[PDB]
Structure 1
């Protein structure tokens, strides 16, 4: 039976939110699935983390027919 163990916290989540500043390369969201997806200039990594490929403002949104969430970067 014997319970009483667990992993470390892996400190996931959103790291920079809507319309934050953020320079290229910065991480926007850690996640396990692609709960969010990669929008414009935001390349998803092998983590599934979404960073940014351009200085700019973060933008959450939801396009398409599966109605899924995309993180864009509005150019700046």
Structure 2
């Protein structure tokens, strides 16, 4: 029933996450990256996370959310190639 024996997490397996989505070439409106599921907002390149910063570029395609509160979960404002 209830839990006991204080402690941090509870040991698991090997992390299953990647980082697909060069976002500097062709990019179909889809999840740019892989780490944690469930999240929306970003419709284009919006790489912005606490620290030195983040970025992406060129790719004309409406909508394109991220993974979640990870690699720049924040939602910036539009961005594309240079002249689609």
- TM-score category of the 2 structures, normalised to the smaller one: under 0.3
Instruction: Give the structure with higher Rg (CA).
Output: 2
CA separation of 1:21 and 1:44: change in aligned 2, threshold 3 A: farther
Deviation per CA, 1:15-47: give whole Å up to 9, x if none.
318999999999999996417469999999999
- TM-score normalised to the size of structure 2? 0.24
SS at match of 2:11: coil
Alpha-carbon distance between aligned partners in 1 of 2:83 and 2:65, rounded to the nearest angstrom: 7
Structure 2, unpaired ranges of 5+: 1-8
Structure 1: tracts of 5 or more residues without a match: none
CA distance in 2, matches of 1:43, 1:53: 27
Q: Compute the displacement of 1:11 (Å).
A: 1.1
Structure with higher strand content: 1
Superposition deviation, residue 68 in structure 1 = 3.1
